Every structure is written in structure tokens, then in C-alpha cells.
């Protein structure tokens, strides 16, 4: 569950991880290092374009595209199962597993 949370992660590594997944509709959530306390939905769109959508944390709520959410998980759920953003969240990209010691 919620494999798509990468915590603190810069833009370049986020784009690397999404491009590694390689399919349009791949996504992750990271807490912006440039704007801490805010988050980014990073999303691989068509034609090798990564979009980085700011998500605003306001009043215990989370805002993206004027829609309001109670948790980052609720936000991911909505753009996966209710409506497109219009592109659709399809493949959650999990953080790289720990390496073989």
C-alpha cells in the first residue's frame, strides 16, 4: 500500500525514477525539497514529458487543481479511481528496494 511515497526527493532523481518505470501514467509523490511542507505529484506523461504538479498542504488539507483532500493518500486515490487530472494515474512507482548487502 502507498508504495508511491518517496519522501524527500529532488526533481532530477524523481524524473530518473519515473523514466526508469518508462510508461505514461507512472507517478510518485515526493515532499518538495525546494518547498518543504509542500508536495509534488511527479507524473510521466506522453512523449517523454514528466510533469511536476504542486500539491498544497492547507489547514490539514491537501490542494491540487482547486480540489481539496484530507490526505496525500486520498489525493492519489481520487486521480486514480474517480477522475482523470485529462491524464490518468496508472502505475505507482515504488522507491528502489534496499540493495543486496
Residue numbers in the entry: 178 to 262, 265 to 280
From the paper:
p120RasGAP is a multidomain regulator of Ras signaling, containing two SH2 domains at its N-terminus and multiple other domains including a RasGAP. Binding of p190RhoGAP is mediated by phosphotyrosine-SH2 domain interactions, and a major driver is thought to be between the N-terminal SH2 of p120RasGAP and pTyr-1105 of p190RhoGAP. p190RhoGAP recruitment has multiple effects, including inhibition of Rho signaling by locating p190RhoGAP to the plasma membrane, and activation of Ras signaling by suppression of p120RasGAP’s RasGAP activity when it is bound to p190RhoGAP. Therefore, in this study we determine the crystal structures of the N-terminal SH2 domain of p120RasGAP alone, and its complex with a phosphorylated peptide corresponding to residues around and including pTyr-1105 of p190RhoGAP. The SH2 fold consists of a central β-sheet flanked by two α-helices, and both crystal structures reveal that the p120RasGAP N-terminal SH2 domain adopts this fold.
We began by expressing and purifying the N-terminal SH2 domain of p120RasGAP alone, and by obtaining apo crystals of this domain. These crystals diffracted well, and we obtained a 1.75 Å dataset that contains 6 copies per asymmetric unit. Of the 6 copies, chains A and B show significantly lower B-factors and improved electron density compared to the other copies and we have based our analyses on these chains. In our crystal structure of apo p120RasGAP, we observe six copies per asymmetric unit arranged as dimers (chains A/B, C/D, E/F). Superposition of the crystallographic dimers reveals that there are two conformational classes, which can be defined by the conformation of the βG and βE-βF loops. Interestingly, these loops important for specificity determination at the +3 position of the phosphopeptide. We observe that in one class the loops are open and poised for peptide binding, and in the other they are closer and seem to occlude peptide binding. In both classes, the B-factors of βG loop are high, and in the occluded form this loop cannot be built in two of the three copies, however, when the bound phosphopeptide structure is superposed on these conformations the occluded state clashes with His-1109 at peptide position +4, but the poised conformation can accommodate binding. We interpret this to indicate conformational flexibility and sampling of the specificity defining loops in the absence of phosphopeptide binding. In the apo structure, we do not observe a similar orientation of arginines, Arg-231 and Arg-212, we therefore infer the cation-π stack to be induced by peptide binding.
